[PDB]
Write a protein that holds these residues in place. Sequence first.
Motif, short mmCIF file in Angstrom:
data_model
loop_
_atom_site.label_atom_id
_atom_site.label_comp_id
_atom_site.label_asym_id
_atom_site.label_seq_id
_atom_site.Cartn_x
_atom_site.Cartn_y
_atom_site.Cartn_z
N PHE A 116 0.84 -1.17 0.00
CA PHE A 116 0.00 0.00 0.00
C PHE A 116 0.88 1.23 0.00
O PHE A 116 1.62 1.46 0.96
CB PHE A 116 -0.90 0.00 1.24
CG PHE A 116 -1.89 1.11 1.48
CD1 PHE A 116 -2.32 1.93 0.45
CD2 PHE A 116 -2.52 1.23 2.71
CE1 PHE A 116 -3.28 2.90 0.67
CE2 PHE A 116 -3.43 2.24 2.95
CZ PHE A 116 -3.84 3.04 1.92
N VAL A 117 0.81 2.02 -1.09
CA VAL A 117 1.54 3.27 -1.20
C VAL A 117 0.44 4.33 -1.25
O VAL A 117 -0.36 4.37 -2.19
CB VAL A 117 2.44 3.32 -2.45
CG1 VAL A 117 3.21 4.64 -2.51
CG2 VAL A 117 3.41 2.13 -2.48
N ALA A 118 0.39 5.18 -0.21
CA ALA A 118 -0.64 6.20 -0.09
C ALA A 118 -0.84 7.04 -1.34
O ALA A 118 0.13 7.55 -1.90
CB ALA A 118 -0.32 7.12 1.08
N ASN A 119 -2.09 7.20 -1.76
CA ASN A 119 -2.45 8.01 -2.93
C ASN A 119 -1.74 7.54 -4.20
O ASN A 119 -1.47 8.35 -5.08
CB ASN A 119 -2.15 9.49 -2.68
CG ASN A 119 -2.70 10.02 -1.38
OD1 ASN A 119 -1.97 10.60 -0.56
ND2 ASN A 119 -4.00 9.86 -1.16
N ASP A 120 -1.40 6.25 -4.29
CA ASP A 120 -0.69 5.73 -5.45
C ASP A 120 -1.15 4.32 -5.85
O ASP A 120 -1.64 4.16 -6.95
CB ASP A 120 0.83 5.78 -5.25
CG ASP A 120 1.61 5.38 -6.49
OD1 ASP A 120 1.19 5.76 -7.61
OD2 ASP A 120 2.64 4.68 -6.34
N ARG A 121 -0.96 3.31 -4.98
CA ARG A 121 -1.32 1.95 -5.36
C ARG A 121 -1.55 1.03 -4.23
O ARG A 121 -1.07 1.24 -3.12
CB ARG A 121 -0.24 1.33 -6.30
CG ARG A 121 1.09 0.97 -5.62
CD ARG A 121 2.07 0.34 -6.60
NE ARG A 121 3.33 -0.07 -5.96
CZ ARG A 121 4.41 0.70 -5.80
NH1 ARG A 121 4.41 1.96 -6.23
NH2 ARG A 121 5.49 0.21 -5.21
N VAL A 122 -2.28 -0.03 -4.54
CA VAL A 122 -2.47 -1.15 -3.65
C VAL A 122 -2.20 -2.40 -4.46
O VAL A 122 -2.70 -2.53 -5.59
CB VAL A 122 -3.87 -1.20 -3.02
CG1 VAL A 122 -4.02 -2.46 -2.16
CG2 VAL A 122 -4.10 0.05 -2.18
N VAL A 123 -1.43 -3.35 -3.88
CA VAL A 123 -1.15 -4.63 -4.51
C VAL A 123 -1.64 -5.72 -3.60
O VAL A 123 -1.35 -5.68 -2.41
CB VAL A 123 0.33 -4.82 -4.82
CG1 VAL A 123 0.60 -6.13 -5.53
CG2 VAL A 123 0.84 -3.64 -5.62
N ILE A 124 -2.40 -6.67 -4.16
CA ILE A 124 -2.85 -7.86 -3.46
C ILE A 124 -2.56 -9.09 -4.34
O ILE A 124 -2.43 -8.99 -5.55
CB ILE A 124 -4.33 -7.76 -3.02
CG1 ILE A 124 -5.21 -7.65 -4.27
CG2 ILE A 124 -4.49 -6.56 -2.11
CD1 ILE A 124 -6.72 -7.39 -3.97
N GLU A 125 -2.40 -10.23 -3.71
CA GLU A 125 -2.02 -11.46 -4.36
C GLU A 125 -2.95 -12.58 -4.05
O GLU A 125 -3.56 -12.64 -3.00
CB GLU A 125 -0.57 -11.86 -4.01
CG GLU A 125 -0.36 -12.28 -2.57
CD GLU A 125 1.01 -12.83 -2.25
OE1 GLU A 125 1.40 -13.83 -2.90
OE2 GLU A 125 1.67 -12.32 -1.32
N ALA A 126 -2.99 -13.57 -4.97
CA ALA A 126 -3.88 -14.71 -4.78
C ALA A 126 -3.66 -15.44 -3.47
O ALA A 126 -2.53 -15.82 -3.15
CB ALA A 126 -3.67 -15.68 -5.91
N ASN A 127 -4.76 -15.72 -2.78
CA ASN A 127 -4.76 -16.53 -1.56
C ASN A 127 -5.28 -17.91 -1.93
O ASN A 127 -6.49 -18.14 -1.93
CB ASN A 127 -5.68 -15.91 -0.49
CG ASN A 127 -5.91 -16.82 0.69
OD1 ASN A 127 -5.04 -17.66 0.99
ND2 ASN A 127 -7.05 -16.68 1.35
N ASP A 128 -4.34 -18.84 -2.24
CA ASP A 128 -4.80 -20.18 -2.62
C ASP A 128 -5.28 -21.02 -1.44
O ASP A 128 -5.85 -22.08 -1.67
CB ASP A 128 -3.75 -20.91 -3.44
CG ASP A 128 -3.63 -20.39 -4.87
OD1 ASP A 128 -4.55 -19.63 -5.31
OD2 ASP A 128 -2.67 -20.78 -5.56
N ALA A 129 -5.17 -20.50 -0.21
CA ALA A 129 -5.76 -21.16 0.95
C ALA A 129 -7.23 -20.72 1.13
O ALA A 129 -7.89 -21.12 2.10
CB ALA A 129 -4.96 -20.83 2.18
#
Length: 478
Positions: free
Chosen positions: A181-194
């Motif tokens: 999480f970069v404020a006012n720029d981006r959010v990255v999330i990844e697959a939760n295979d569980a």
Amino acid sequence: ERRALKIGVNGIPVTLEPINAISNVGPRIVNQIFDTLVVRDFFSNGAPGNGINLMPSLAESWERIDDKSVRFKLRQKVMFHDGVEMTADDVAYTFSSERLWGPDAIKVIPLGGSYALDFDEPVVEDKYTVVIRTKTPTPLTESYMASWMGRIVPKAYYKTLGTAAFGNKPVGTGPYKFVEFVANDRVVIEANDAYWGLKPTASKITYQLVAEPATRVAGLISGEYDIVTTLTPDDMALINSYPDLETRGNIVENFHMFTFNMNQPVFQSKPLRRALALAVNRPLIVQSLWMNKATIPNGFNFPNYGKTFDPNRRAMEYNIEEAKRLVKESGYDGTPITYHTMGNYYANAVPALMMMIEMWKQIGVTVVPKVYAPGGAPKDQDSYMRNWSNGQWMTDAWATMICEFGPKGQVQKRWGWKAPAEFNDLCTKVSQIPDSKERFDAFNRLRDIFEEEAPAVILYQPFDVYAARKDVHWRPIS
Ligand SMILES: *O[C@@H]1[C@@H](CO)O[C@@](CO)(O[C@H]2O[C@H](CO)[C@@H](O)[C@H](O)[C@H]2O)[C@H]1O
Ligand SMILES: *OP(=O)(O)O[C@@H]1[C@@H](O)[C@@H](O)CO[C@@H]1O
């Protein structure tokens, strides 16, 4: 084949704590990190995407016991992203006084004081069984659990960090887990295979802020983005002319508005607020900027309210003569008034504002635009007019007339609207009586007072447009 998705968005939430992220831009991210007990079937009863029948999710089953209590039987072996099993303790904490609706909680989650039902403390019967309770009767509990107020948080981890810090490193049970999480720029999330449910179909999702819509359209055309949000009907012809791209548009259960800081003396009284409201030519704005696709509601009144929707209610007023009379009746002396907007965080915010400046100039009021970038919001003492929106998030008129404009809401508390005593008494009444002729009539009296006082001015429900590559068949943009 699981691709990494790159999504060009209009905005990024200030936090990923699910309630404090409630906004036009937060839910599309937090809906992938967290789950709810139940979910709406958006296509139930033949509905074209706005259906309301409730289906299992983290709760495998549920039973209303009485007018105050609902028992949820939880799925077993559901894992939070850190490997801790979800149990009734987590669900109980999510809707606890300590976290959500108590006095200390409302200091760090302001919506816990206005968007909460009249909860009592949940009861844990066993590891996988929790009873959600209200101090007074309400039929809304089950549907509330499918809403943006119902996302389940991990008790131990959340309580250790506290609401604000949790919001920077969220842990949930959803199909994607937090990465960055970069404020006012981006959010990255990844697959939760569980994940307990269907396996995630993308490897990763990046939500990247692209403030200007023409830059988002260009990024989709160049292949930099797989999906882009918050476009307007005007962008559809160009995008659809590319055989590998497409657009999707629909009316959303949300209205755009402008509103006032009623702590400012220029807006402490209703005359100038109502003058600005009566000078807005909504059909002209809709015709010029929305290809006549945005909808103008007949008041603070939407079909999704069900039993509290009034299909026969009159249109909101447009009266230049009365607006001119109210400007002169007020002490207004020609002093310029600022209107703050975070660019086009709201679609067509700036072009709509420029049109309204001309309408206001025609009634003798000088309004000046103050366009700011993400994170550059003015202090409340420097805010006069501003734009906003409200999502109509319940199948009941309680949302948002009461939860935003009622006595516990931010319009009265933070922004200083001195609502008439009848308005606040009617808010109290509707929240304690069942659906009936009295409740229906009471909501119409609230709508009438809202138009008389003009704490906000409804513009229209936007025709929301998103765009994507045709070969991207799953689009987490909510
Ligand atoms: O409707 C948005 C509301 C949400 O609480 O706050 C505003 C400002 O009045 O936006 C802020 O919060 C959202 C959500 O965190 C951010 O994405 C915005 O950048 C921020 O201005 C309303 O637009
Ligand atoms: O993004 P934004 O318009 O400020 O969000 C509103 C939120 O503040 C609340 O009113 C519910 O509807 C939208 O999400």
